[PDB]
Amino acid sequence: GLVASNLNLKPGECLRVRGEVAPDAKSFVLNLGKDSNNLCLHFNPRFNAHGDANTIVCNSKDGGAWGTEQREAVFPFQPGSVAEVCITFDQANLTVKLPDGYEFKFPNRLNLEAINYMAADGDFKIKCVAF
C-alpha cells in the first residue's frame, strides 16, 4: 500500500488518514515511525486474521525488533465503510483518534524527534492523507 516519507510530523501535529475498508476485509495496517525497521506505532485492526477477529492490535518496532503487543477492547471499524484515523504524539504517548468518538493511547517507546515515515498495507484503500 501507500508509503510516505519525509513527513516531518512534529509532536502535537496531526496526521489524518481516510480510507475505504474492503467489504471482506481481514486486516489492515498503518505503520508510523522513522522507517520500516523503526516504528513508533504499528496500528493493526484485525477483522479476521492471525487467529483474531474484530481486534485492534498495536505494537512498536525498534531496530527491527517487535515490542510488546497491546490490544484494545473496542473495535470501531466496519468492513465496507469509510474510516478516518487521526494520529498525534508527545514524548509519553501516541494518541490515536478514531471515528465513533474513540481515542486511545499507545506508549511512545522510540522517542523519535518526528514521525517521518508512514506505510499502509492490507484491506484499506487510502483516499486522502492530511499532514
Ligand X SMILES: CO[C@@H]1O[C@H](COS(=O)(=O)O)[C@@H](O)[C@H](O[C@@H]2O[C@H](CO)[C@H](O)[C@H](O)[C@H]2O)[C@H]1NC(C)=O
Q: Is 54 annotated as a binding residue?
A: no
CA neighbor of 17 nearest in space, from 52, 57, 45: 45
Residue 10 lies near its own copies (rule: CB under 8 A):
no
79's contact among its own copies, ligand X, none, with CB below 5 to 8 A by partner kind, is: none
CB of 120 to its own copies, least distance (A): 9
Q: How many whole angstroms from its chain centre is CA 94?
A: 10
CB of 35 to ligand X, least distance (A): 16
Residues 47-106 that bind ligand X (CB under 6 A): 50-52, 57, 59, 66, 69
59's contact among its own copies, ligand X, none, with CB below 5 to 8 A by partner kind, is: ligand X
42's contact among its own copies, ligand X, none, with CB below 5 to 8 A by partner kind, is: ligand X
Residue 37 lies near ligand X (rule: CB under 6 A):
no
Q: Which amino acid is at 24?
A: D
Q: Which of 3, 14, 53, 74 binds its own copies (CB under 8 A)?
A: 3
Q: What does the angle CA 40 – CA 44 – CA 47 come to, to the nearest 5 degrees?
A: 170
CA distance 127 to 95: 22
C-alpha distances in Å from residue 95, one per residue of 79, 85, 101, 119, 125:
23, 10, 13, 18, 22
